[PDB]
Amino acid sequence: SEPIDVESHLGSITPGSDDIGYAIVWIKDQVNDVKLKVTLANAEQLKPYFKYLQIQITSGYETNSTALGNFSETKAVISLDNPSAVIVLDKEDIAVLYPDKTGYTNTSIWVPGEPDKIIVYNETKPVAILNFKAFYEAKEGMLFDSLPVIFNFQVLQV
Secondary structure: OOOEEEEEEEOOEEOOEEEEEEEEEEEEOOOOOOEEEEEOOOOHHHHHEEEEEEEEEEEEEEOOOOOOEEEEEEEEEOOOOOOEEEEEEEEHOOOOOOOOOOOOOEEEEEEOOEEEEEEEEEOOOOOEEEEEEEEEEOOOOOOOOEEOEEEEEEEEEE
16 A cells, blocks of 8 residues: 655754754555665755764654653754655554543544644554754854755555
8 A cells, every 4th residue: 555644844954953853654555564765966066065963763652652652762863964764653662542442542643842832632543653953063164153954755565
């Protein structure tokens, strides 16, 4: 089937570390595991500009369901000369609520550290949340207010 839909909530680099946002990976209910390629698509475009730039991909979510529990796992670090990474999402990466079972009553899943960014409320709708953090230094003489960050997402296997 077409097993995942990606919802991008990614920002730009604006200064040498900051959160760039997150992508929501909606996973269809029958899917056990997915191998994704995440690529810094505009890496070339940013090279003339940084002394280094590294993006750390972290799979993670928080919740008030005691049955599910919070989860966090670094998956990859990509950089300007190493712009793509293959990410496996399985087991704990795929948060699921079962509203009728104990430990899930009236519970929800949200972006880590952002309890107002509810992603799922009180339903069975499996999801993975990729959280993006950028580590960088501009080159000397390069000053900028913001620069774009373009990601591509490519399903390799399901």
